[PDB]
Amino acid sequence: MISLIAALAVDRVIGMENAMPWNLPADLAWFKRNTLDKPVIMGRHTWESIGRPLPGRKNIILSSQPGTDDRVTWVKSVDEAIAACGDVPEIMVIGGGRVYEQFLPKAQKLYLTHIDAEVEGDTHFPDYEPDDWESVFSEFHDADAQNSHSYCFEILERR
């Protein structure tokens, strides 16, 4: 199955011009723990903000143009994206906006991180009807010496 993994500030903002202005090592740790050993699908802008292959994971990048790095996999469509995954139990879609909108429909599960931050951005998570998703986990955490803002982990399953 397909799962999307994302980190949302208030109002589902998930992106802007430059890197999101927050320091959340706790989020990244969760990102890793839930993506390790799986295939990762991301769009070109997300690949740029990451700038190097994610280890231990199979990296597939969506782009209408030829790729720029021999290290990872490049695909030109959603269907090639999947097919490149092979037979696998779970597929993780990691950003950005455009990719999420195309994939939200195929997804069975969501991995959200609701961050208590208000930032002005140009990219939003797509809307989703809770009355379609069943929350199967959730856990909040206050900000601290390591994480710049409060955040809460949450997992939902398509009903």
Ligand X SMILES: NC(=O)c1ccc[n+]([C@@H]2O[C@H](COP(=O)([O-])OP(=O)(O)OC[C@H]3O[C@@H](n4cnc5c(N)ncnc54)[C@H](OP(=O)(O)O)[C@@H]3O)[C@@H](O)[C@H]2O)c1
Ligand Y SMILES: CN(Cc1cnc2nc(N)nc(N)c2n1)c1ccc(C(=O)N[C@@H](CCC(=O)O)C(=O)O)cc1
Nearest to 31 by CA among 88, 94, 100, 82: 94
Q: Which of 79, 127, 131, 146 binds a second copy (CB under 8 A)?
A: 146
CA distance 97 to 13: 9
Pairing of strands 109-115, 151-158: antiparallel
Q: 3-state DSSP call for residue 19?
A: coil
13 annotated to a ligand binding site: yes
- E strands present in 83-125: 91-93, 109-115, 123-124
CA distance 95 to 113: 13
Per-residue binding string, a second copy, 57-86, x by CB under 8 A, is ------------------------------
Q: Identify what 31 binds: a second copy, ligand Y, ligand X, none; CB under 5 to 8 Å per kind.
A: ligand Y
Q: Which of 5, 20, 40, 112 binds a second copy (CB under 8 A)?
A: 20
Least Å distance, CB 28 to a second copy, is: 10
Q: Which of 1, 10, 11, 49 binds a second copy (CB under 8 A)?
A: 49
- Tokens representing 12 are 């589902």
Distance of CA 107 to the CA centre of its chain: 12
Which residues make Cβ contacts (< 8 Å) with residue 48, sequence separation at least 6?
A: none
Q: Is 98 annotated as a binding residue?
A: yes
Report if residue 22 touches a second copy, rule: CB under 8 A: yes
60 known member of a binding site: no
Q: Which residues contact ligand X (rule: CB under 6 A)?
A: 15-17, 42-46, 62-65, 76-78, 95-99, 102, 122-123
| Residues contributing to the annotated binding site | 5, 7, 13-19, 27, 45-46, 52, 57, 63-64, 76, 95-102, 113
